[PDB]
Coordinates of C-alpha atoms and ligand atoms in Angstrom, one line a residue:
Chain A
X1 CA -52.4 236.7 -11.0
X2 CA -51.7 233.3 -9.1
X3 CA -55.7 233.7 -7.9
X4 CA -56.8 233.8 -11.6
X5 CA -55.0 230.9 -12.6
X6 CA -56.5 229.2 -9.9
X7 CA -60.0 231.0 -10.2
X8 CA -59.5 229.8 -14.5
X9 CA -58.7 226.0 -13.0
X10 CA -61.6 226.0 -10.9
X11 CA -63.7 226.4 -13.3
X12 CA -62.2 224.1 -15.6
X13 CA -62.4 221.3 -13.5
X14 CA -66.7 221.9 -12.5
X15 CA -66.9 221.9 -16.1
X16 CA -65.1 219.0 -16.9
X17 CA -67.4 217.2 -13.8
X18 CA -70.6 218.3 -15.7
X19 CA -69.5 217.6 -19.4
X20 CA -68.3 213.9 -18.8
X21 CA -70.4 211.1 -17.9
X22 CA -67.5 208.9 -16.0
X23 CA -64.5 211.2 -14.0
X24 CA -61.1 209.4 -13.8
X25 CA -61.6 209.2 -9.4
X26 CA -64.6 206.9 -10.2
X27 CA -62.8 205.1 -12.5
X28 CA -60.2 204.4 -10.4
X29 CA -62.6 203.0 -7.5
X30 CA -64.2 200.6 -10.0
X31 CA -61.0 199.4 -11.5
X32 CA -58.7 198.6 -8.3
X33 CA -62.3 197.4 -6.6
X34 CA -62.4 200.3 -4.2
X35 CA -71.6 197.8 -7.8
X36 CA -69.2 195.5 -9.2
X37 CA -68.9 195.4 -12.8
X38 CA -70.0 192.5 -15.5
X39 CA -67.1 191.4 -17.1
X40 CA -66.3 190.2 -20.9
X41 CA -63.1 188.4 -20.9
X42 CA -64.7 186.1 -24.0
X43 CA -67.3 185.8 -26.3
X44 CA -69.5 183.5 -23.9
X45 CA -69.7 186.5 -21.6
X46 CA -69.8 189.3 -24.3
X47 CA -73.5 187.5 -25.7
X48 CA -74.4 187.6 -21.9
X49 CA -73.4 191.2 -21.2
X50 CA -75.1 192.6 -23.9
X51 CA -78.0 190.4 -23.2
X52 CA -78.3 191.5 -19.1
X53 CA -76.8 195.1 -19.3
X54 CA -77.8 196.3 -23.1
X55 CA -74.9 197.9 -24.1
X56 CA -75.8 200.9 -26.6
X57 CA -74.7 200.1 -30.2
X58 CA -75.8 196.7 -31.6
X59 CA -77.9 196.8 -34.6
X60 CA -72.4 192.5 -39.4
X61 CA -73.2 189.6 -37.0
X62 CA -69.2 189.1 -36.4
X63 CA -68.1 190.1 -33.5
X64 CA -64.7 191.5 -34.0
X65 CA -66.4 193.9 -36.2
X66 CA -69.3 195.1 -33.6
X67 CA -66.6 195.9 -30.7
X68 CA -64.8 198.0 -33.5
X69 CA -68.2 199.6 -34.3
X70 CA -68.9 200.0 -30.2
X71 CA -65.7 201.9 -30.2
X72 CA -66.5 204.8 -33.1
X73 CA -70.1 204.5 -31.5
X74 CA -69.1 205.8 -28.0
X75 CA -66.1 208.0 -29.6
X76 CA -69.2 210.0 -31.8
X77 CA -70.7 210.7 -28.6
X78 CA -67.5 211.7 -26.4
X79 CA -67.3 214.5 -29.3
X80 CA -70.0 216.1 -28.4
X81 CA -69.1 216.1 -24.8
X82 CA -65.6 217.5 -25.8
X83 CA -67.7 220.1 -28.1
X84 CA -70.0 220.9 -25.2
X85 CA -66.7 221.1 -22.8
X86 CA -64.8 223.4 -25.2
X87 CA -67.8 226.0 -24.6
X88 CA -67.0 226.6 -21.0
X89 CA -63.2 227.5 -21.9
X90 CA -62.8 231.3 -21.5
X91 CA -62.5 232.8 -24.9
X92 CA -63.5 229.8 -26.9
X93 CA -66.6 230.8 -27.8
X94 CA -65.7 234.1 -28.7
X95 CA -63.3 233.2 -31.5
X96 CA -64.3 232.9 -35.0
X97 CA -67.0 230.1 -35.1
X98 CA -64.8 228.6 -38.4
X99 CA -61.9 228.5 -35.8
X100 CA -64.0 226.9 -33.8
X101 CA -65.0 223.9 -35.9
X102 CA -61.5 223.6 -36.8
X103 CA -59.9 223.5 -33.3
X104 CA -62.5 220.7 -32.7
X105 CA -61.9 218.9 -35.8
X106 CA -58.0 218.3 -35.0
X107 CA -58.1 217.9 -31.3
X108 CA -61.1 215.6 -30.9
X109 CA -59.0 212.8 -31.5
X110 CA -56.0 213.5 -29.2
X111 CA -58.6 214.2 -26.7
X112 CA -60.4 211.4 -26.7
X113 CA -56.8 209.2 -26.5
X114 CA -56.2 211.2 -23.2
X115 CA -59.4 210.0 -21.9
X116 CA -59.9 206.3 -22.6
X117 CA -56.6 206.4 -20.6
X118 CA -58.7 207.2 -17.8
X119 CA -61.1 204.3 -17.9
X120 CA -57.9 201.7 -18.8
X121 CA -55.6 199.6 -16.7
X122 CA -53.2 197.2 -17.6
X123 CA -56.0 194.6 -17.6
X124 CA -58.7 196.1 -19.7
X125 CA -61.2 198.9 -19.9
X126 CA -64.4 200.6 -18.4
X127 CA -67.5 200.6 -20.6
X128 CA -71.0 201.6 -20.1
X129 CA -70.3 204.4 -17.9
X130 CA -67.9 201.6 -15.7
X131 CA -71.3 199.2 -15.3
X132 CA -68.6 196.8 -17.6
X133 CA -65.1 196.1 -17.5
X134 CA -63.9 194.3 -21.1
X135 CA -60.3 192.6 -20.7
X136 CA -57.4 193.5 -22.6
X137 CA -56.7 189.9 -23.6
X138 CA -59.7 189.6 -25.2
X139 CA -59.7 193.0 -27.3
X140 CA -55.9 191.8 -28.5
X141 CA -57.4 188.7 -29.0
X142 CA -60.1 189.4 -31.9
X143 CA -58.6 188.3 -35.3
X144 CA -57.2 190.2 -38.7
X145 CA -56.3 194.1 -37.8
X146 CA -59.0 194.3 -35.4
X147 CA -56.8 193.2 -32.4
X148 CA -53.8 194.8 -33.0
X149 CA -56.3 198.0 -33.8
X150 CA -56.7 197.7 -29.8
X151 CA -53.4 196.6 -28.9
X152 CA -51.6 200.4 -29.5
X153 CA -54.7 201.9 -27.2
X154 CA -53.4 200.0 -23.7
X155 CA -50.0 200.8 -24.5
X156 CA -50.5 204.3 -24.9
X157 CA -52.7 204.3 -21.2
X158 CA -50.0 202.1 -19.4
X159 CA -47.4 205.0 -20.0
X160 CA -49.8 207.8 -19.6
X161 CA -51.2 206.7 -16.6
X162 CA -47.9 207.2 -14.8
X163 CA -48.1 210.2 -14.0
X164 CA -50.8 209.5 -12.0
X165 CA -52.7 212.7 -12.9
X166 CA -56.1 213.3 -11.5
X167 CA -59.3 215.1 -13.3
X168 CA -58.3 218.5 -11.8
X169 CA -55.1 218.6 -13.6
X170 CA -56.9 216.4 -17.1
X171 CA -59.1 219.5 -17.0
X172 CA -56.7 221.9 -17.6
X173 CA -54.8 219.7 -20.2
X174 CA -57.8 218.6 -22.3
X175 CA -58.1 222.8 -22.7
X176 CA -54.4 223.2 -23.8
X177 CA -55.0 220.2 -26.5
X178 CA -58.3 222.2 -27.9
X179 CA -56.1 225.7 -28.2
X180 CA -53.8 224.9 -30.5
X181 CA -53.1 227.9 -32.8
X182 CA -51.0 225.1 -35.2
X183 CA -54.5 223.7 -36.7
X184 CA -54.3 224.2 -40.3
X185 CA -56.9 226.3 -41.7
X186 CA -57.1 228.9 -38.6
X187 CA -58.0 231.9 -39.7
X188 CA -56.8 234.2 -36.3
X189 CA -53.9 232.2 -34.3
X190 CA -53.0 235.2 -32.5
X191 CA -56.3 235.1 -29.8
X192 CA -55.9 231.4 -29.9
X193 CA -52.4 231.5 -28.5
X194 CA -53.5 234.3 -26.2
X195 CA -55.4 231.6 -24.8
X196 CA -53.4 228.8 -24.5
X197 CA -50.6 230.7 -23.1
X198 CA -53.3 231.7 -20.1
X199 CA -54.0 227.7 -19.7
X200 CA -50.5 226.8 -19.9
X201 CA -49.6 229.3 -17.0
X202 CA -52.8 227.9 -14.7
X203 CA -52.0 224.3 -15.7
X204 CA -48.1 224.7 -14.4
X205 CA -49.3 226.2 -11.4
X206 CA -52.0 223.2 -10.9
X207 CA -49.0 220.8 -11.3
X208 CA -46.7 222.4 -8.9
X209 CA -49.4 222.9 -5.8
X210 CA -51.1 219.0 -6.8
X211 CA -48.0 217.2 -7.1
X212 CA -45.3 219.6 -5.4
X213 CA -42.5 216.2 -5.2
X214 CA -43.1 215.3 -9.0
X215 CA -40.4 217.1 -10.7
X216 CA -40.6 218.5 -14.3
X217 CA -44.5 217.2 -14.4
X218 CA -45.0 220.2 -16.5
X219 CA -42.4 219.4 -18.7
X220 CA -43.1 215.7 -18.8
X221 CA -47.0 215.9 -19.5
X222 CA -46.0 218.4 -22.6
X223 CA -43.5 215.6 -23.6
X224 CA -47.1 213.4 -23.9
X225 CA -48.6 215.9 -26.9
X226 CA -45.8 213.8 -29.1
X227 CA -47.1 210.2 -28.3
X228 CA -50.6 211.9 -28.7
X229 CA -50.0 213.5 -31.9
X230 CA -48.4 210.3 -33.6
X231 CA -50.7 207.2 -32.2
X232 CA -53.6 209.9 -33.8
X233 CA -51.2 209.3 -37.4
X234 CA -50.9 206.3 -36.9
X235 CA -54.5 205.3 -35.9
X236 CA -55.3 206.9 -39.3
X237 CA -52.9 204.6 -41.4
X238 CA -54.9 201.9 -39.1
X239 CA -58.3 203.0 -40.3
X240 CA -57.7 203.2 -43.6
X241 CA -56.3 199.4 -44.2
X242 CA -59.7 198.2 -42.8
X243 CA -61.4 200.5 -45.1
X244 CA -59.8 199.1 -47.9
X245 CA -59.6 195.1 -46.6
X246 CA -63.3 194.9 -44.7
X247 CA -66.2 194.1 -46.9
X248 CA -68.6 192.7 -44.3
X249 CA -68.0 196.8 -42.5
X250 CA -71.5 197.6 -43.9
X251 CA -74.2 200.1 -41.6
X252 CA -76.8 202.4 -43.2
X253 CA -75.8 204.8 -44.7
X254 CA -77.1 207.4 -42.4
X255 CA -75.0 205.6 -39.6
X256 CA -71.8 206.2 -42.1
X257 CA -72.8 209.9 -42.1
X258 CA -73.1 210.3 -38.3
X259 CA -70.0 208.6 -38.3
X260 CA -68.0 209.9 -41.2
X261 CA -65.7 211.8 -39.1
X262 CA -64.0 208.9 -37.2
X263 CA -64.0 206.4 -40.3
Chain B
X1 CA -31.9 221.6 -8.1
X2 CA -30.7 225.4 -7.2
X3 CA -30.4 228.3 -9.4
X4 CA -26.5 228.5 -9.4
X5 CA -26.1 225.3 -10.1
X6 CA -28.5 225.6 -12.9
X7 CA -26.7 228.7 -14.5
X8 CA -23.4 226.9 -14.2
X9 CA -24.6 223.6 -16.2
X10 CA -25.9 226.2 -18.6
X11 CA -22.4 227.9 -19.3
X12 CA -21.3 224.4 -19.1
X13 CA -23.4 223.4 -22.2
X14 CA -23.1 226.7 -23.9
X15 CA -19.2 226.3 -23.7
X16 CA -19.2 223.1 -25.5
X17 CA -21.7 223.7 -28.0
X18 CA -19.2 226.6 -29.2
X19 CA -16.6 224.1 -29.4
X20 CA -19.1 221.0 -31.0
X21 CA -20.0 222.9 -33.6
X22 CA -18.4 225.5 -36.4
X23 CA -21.2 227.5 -37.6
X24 CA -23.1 228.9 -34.8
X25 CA -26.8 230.7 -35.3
X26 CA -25.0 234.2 -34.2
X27 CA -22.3 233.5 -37.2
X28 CA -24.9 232.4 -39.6
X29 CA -27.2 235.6 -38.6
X30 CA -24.5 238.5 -38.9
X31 CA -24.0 236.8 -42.6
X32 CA -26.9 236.6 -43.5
X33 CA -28.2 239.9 -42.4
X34 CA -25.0 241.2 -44.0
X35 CA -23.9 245.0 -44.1
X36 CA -20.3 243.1 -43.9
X37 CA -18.1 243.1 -47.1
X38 CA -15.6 240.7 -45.4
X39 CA -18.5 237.4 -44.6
X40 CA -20.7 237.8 -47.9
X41 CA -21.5 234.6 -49.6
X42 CA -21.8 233.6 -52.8
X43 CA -24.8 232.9 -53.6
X44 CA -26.3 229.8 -55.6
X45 CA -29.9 230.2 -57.7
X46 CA -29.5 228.0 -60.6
X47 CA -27.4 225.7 -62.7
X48 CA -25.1 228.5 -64.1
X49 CA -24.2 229.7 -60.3
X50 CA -24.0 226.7 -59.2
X51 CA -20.5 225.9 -61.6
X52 CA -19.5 229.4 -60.9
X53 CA -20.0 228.7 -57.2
X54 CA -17.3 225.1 -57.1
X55 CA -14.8 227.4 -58.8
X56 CA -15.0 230.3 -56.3
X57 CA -15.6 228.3 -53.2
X58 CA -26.2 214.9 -62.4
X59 CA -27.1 218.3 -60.6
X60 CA -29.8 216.8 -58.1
X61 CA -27.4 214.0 -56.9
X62 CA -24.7 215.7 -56.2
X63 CA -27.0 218.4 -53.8
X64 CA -28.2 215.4 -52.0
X65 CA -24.8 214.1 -51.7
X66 CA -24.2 218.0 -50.5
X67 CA -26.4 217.6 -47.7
X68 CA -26.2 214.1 -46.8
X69 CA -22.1 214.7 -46.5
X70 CA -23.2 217.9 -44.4
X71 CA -25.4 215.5 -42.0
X72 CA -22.6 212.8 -41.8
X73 CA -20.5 215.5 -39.9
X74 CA -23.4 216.9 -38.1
X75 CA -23.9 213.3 -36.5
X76 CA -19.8 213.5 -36.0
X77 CA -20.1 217.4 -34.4
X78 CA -23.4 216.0 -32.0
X79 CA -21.9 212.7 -31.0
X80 CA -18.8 215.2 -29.6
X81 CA -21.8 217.4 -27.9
X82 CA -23.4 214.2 -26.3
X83 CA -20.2 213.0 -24.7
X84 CA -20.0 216.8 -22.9
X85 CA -23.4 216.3 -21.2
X86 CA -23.0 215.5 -17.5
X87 CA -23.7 212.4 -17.2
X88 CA -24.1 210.8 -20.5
X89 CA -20.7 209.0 -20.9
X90 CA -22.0 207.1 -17.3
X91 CA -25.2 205.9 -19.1
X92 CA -24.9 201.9 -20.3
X93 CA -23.0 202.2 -23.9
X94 CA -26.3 200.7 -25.5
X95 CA -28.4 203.3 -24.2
X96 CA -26.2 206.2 -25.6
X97 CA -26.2 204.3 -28.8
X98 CA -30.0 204.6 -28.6
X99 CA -30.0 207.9 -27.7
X100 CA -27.5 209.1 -30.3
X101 CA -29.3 207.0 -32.9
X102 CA -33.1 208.4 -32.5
X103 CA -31.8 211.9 -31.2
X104 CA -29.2 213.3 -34.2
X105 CA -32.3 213.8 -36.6
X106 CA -34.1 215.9 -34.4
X107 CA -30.8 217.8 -34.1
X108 CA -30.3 218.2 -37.1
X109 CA -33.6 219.7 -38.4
X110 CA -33.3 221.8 -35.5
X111 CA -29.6 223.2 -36.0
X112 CA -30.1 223.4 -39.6
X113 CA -32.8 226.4 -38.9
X114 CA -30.0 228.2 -37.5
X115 CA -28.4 228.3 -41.2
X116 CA -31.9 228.9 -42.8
X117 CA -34.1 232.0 -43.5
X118 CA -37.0 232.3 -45.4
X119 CA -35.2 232.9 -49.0
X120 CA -32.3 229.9 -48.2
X121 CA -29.6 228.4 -46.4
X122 CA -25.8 228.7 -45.7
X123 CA -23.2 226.1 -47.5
X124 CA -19.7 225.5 -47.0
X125 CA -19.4 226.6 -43.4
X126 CA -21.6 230.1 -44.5
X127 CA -19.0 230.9 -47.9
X128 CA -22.4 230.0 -49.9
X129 CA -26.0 230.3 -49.7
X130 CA -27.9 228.4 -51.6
X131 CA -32.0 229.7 -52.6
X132 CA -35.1 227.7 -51.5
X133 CA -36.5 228.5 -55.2
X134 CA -33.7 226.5 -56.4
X135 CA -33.4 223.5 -54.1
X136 CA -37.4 223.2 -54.7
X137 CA -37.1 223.5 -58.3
X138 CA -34.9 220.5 -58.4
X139 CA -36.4 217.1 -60.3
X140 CA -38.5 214.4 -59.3
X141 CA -38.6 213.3 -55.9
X142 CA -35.8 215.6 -54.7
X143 CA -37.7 219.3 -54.7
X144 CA -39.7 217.9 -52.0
X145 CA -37.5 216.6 -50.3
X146 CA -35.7 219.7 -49.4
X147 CA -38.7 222.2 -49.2
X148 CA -40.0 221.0 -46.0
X149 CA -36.6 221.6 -44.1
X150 CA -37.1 225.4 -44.9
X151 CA -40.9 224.9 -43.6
X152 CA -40.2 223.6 -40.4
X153 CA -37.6 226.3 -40.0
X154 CA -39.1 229.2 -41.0
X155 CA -41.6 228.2 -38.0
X156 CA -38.6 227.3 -35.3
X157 CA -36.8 230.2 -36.0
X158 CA -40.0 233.1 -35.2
X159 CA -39.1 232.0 -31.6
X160 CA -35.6 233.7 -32.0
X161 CA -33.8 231.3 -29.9
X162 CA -29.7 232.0 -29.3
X163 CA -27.3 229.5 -29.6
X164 CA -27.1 229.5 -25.5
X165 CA -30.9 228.4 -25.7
X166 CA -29.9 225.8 -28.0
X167 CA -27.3 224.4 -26.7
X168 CA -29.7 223.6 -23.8
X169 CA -32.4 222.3 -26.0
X170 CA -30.6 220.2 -27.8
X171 CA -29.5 218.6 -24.7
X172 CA -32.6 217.9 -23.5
X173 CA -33.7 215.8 -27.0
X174 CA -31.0 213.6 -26.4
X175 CA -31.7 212.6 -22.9
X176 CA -35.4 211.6 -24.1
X177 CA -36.5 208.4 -22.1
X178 CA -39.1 207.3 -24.4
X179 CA -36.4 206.0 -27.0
X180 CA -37.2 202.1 -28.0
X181 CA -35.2 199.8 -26.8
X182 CA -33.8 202.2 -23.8
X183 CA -32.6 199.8 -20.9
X184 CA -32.3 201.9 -17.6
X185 CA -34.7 204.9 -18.3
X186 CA -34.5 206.3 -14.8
X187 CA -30.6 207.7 -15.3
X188 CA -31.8 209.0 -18.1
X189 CA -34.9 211.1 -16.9
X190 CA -32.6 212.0 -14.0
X191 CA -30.5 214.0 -16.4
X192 CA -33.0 215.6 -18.7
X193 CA -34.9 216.5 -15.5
X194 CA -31.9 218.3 -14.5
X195 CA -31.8 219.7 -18.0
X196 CA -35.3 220.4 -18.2
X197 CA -34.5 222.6 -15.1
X198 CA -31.1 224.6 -16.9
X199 CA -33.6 225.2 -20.2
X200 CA -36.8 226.7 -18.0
X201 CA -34.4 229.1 -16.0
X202 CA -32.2 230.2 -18.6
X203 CA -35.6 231.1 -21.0
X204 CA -37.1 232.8 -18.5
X205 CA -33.7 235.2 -17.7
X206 CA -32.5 235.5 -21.5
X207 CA -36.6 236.2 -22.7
X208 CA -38.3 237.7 -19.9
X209 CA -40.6 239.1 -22.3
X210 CA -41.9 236.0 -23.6
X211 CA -44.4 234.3 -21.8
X212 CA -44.3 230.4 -21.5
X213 CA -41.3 230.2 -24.1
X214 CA -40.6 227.1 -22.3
X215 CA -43.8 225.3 -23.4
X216 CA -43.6 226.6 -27.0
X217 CA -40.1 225.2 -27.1
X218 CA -41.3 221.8 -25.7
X219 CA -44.7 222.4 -28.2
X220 CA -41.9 222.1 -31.0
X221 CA -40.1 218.8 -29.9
X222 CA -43.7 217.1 -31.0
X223 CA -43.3 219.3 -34.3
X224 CA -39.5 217.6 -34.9
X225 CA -40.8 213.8 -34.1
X226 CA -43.2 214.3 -36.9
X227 CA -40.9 215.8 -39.6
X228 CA -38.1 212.9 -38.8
X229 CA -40.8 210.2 -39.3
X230 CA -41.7 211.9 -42.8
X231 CA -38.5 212.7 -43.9
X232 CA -37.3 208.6 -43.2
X233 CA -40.4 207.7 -45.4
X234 CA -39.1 210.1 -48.4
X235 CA -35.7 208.8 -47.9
X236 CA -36.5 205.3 -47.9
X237 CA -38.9 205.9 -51.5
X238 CA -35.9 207.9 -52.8
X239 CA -33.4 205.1 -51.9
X240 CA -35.7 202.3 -53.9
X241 CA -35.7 204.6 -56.9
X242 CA -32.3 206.0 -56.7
X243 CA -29.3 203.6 -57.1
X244 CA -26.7 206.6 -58.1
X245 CA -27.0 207.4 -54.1
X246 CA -24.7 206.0 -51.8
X247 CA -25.4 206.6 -47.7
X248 CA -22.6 206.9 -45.6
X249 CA -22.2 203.7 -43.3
X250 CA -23.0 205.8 -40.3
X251 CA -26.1 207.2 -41.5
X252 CA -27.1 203.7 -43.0
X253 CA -26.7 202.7 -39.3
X254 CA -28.7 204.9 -37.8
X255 CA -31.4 203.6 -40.5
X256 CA -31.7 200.4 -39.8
X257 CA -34.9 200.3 -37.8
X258 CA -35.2 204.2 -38.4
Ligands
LIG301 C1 -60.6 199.5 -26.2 C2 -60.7 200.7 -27.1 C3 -60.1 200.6 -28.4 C4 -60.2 201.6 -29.3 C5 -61.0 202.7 -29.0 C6 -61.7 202.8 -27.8 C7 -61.6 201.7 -26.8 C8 -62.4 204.0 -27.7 C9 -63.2 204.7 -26.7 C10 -62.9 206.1 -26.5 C11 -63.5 206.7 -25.4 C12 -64.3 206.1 -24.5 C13 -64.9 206.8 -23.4 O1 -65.8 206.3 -22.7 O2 -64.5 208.0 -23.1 C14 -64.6 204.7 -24.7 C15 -64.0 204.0 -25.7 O3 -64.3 202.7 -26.0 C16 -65.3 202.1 -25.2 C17 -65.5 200.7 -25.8 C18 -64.6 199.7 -25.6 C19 -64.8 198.5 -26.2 C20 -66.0 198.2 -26.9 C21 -66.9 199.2 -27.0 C22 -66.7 200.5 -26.5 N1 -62.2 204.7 -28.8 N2 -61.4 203.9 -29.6 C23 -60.9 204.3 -30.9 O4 -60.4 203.5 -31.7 C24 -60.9 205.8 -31.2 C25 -60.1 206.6 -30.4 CL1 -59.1 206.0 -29.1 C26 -60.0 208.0 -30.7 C27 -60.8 208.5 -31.7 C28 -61.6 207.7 -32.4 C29 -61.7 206.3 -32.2 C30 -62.6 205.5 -33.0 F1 -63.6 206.2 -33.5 F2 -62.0 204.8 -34.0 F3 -63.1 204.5 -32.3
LIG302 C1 -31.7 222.4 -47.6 C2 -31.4 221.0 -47.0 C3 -32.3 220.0 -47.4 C4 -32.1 218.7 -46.9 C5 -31.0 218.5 -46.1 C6 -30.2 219.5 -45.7 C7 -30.4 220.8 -46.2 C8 -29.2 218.9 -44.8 C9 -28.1 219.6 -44.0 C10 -28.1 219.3 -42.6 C11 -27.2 219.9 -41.8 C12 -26.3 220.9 -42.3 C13 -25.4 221.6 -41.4 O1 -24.6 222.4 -42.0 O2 -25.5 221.5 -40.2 C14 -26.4 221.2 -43.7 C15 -27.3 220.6 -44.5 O3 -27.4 220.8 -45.8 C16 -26.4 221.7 -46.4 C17 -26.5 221.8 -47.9 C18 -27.6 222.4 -48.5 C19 -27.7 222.4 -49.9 C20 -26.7 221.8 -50.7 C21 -25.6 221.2 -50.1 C22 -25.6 221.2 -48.7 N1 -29.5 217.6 -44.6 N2 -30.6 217.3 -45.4 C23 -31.1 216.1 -45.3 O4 -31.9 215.7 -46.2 C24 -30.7 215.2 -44.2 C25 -31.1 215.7 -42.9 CL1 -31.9 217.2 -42.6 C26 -30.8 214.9 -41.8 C27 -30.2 213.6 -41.9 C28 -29.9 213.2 -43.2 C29 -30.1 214.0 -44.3 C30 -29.7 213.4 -45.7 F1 -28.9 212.4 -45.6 F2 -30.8 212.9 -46.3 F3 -29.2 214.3 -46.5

């Protein structure tokens, strides 16, 4: 069955090409300068970004509090690429459509922690499908909880990014993450675990022939669902102290309900 | 690196957790599946049992105290473990602190499944079992403290792991290189990969039947790092509320700084 697990990553990873807007390779290019990106390293060149590239989201003049809403913003719309992703899984679609909704609903997050790793360095991150580059210094930089709300994000990437994975082997992952049969409220675990045993095997297999000198890569990726599992707790605790502290956190309230799921 | 080798640190690791530790899973099963006059416990359901039970072997308080002198010698019975595992003794001493310090939780959760079914869980090296209805039935803040032990291993212990598997596992926890504060992380990531290694090898030989064991097994270290942070929350709300408990210095140790 080695043909099926590769025949099962295969078509993970054209998915995964189709689904997202930005793959890690490109990333990579732009970041280590390999169409050179604007750059916000302050708020001088923040009012001129927004003002020559037009980043999507500005509608709270303050501008701590507009980069926080820019990242649920984009983070709304990487859900539906996940959603759209998690279609193309074998099985997926074929499990109860409740199971379904719930898989999603507890593995978005993780998810989309994998992935900003992808579009983060050491030095800052990729926006606007990697047209910007906005510097770490400045996101740990904006005042109250909003900095240290961006701080954790970095930290998380820097250690992540060691392993130097590529979108082939992300492809695979991303699918373990979405079937977990541990989700509370599942209905039927059993076809869930059917599944995720299947992507298991392929993504072992995709480690061993991508990266045949790292050792234990299997093991040590695995290892990564634990930081995933409790930044996502502890972005939560995060949330909900600027919920409580932030007054001036005010959109429509039809923009609350698009975003209700993230805030 | 090479299968022999791999077998051998696993009979290495097996032979000293047999000598770690006094209750192993394979005692704690044959009593508490029974059909042997000579091992049955007595067993513990409410308050009237529970005075029968310290002649033949506040009420809350002294349970706690039960299971927090239990954990004192469980950190004891690891420490030993830790010292066996090629390697470790090598590591700088503030790294095996650190390990030791972050690591004996985890243990501890996962060892204490051994001594668990669904109904309760063995006392006084397996001469008692004790119900889950009672423990949960206790006051205030300790019934819930002690319910979510028997939930994690009610979940740990559908993968039917032996005390050979264990021994591995627990191994591996311990040589984690994402501990805070760890100074040379390499030596240790050398080890658990050699660990790592043992553990995947001896699954698949002792459950060839059960595909990708070694993931599920992994799956459930993210389950333990989890529990540990809750149960350090409880503790800490139970200590501020709670003067009549007194933590052993050790376990105060490990704490400080959780
Ligand atoms: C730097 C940072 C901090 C917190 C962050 C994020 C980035 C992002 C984020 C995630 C995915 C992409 C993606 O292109 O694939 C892009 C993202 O930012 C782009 C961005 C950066 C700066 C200003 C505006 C827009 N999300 N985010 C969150 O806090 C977050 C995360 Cl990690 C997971 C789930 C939900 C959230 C959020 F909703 F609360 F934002
Ligand atoms: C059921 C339960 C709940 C919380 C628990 C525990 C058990 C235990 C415990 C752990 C290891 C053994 C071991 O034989 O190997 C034994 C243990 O109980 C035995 C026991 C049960 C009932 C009455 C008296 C004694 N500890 N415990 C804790 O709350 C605990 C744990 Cl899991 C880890 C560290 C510290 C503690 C404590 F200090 F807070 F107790």
């Amino acid at each position: 069955e080695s043909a099926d697990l590769r025949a099962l990553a295969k078509h993970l990873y054209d998915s995964y090409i189709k689904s997202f807007p930005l793959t890690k390779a490109k990333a990579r290019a732009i970041l280590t300068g390999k169409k050179s990106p604007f750059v916000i390293y302050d708020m001088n060149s923040l009012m001129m970004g927004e003002d020559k590239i037009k980043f999507k989201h500005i509608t709270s003049k303050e501008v701590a509090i507009r980069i926080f809403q820019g990242c649920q913003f984009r983070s709304v719309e990487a859900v539906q690429e996940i959603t759209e992703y998690a279609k193309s899984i074998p099985g997926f679609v074929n499990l109860d459509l409740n199971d379904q909704v719930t898989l999603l609903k507890y593995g978005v997050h993780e998810i989309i922690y994998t992935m900003l790793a992808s579009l983060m360095n050491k030095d800052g991150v990729l926006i606007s499908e990697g047209q910007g580059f906005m510097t770490r210094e400045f996101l740990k930089s904006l005042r109250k909880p909003f900095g240290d709300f961006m701080e954790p994000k970095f930290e998380f990437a820097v250690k992540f990014n060691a392993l130097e994975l590529d979108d082939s082997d992300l492809a695979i992952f991303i699918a373990v993450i979405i079937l977990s049969g541990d989700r509370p409220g599942l209905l039927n675990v059993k076809p869930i675990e059917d599944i995720q045993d299947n992507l298991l095997q392929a993504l072992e297999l995709q480690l061993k022939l991508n990266h045949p000198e790292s050792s234990q890569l299997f093991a040590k990726l695995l290892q990564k669902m634990t930081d995933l599992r409790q930044i996502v707790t502890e972005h939560v605790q995060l949330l909900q102290v600027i919920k409580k502290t932030e007054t001036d956190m005010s959109l429509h309230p039809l923009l609350q309900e698009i975003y209700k799921d993230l805030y």
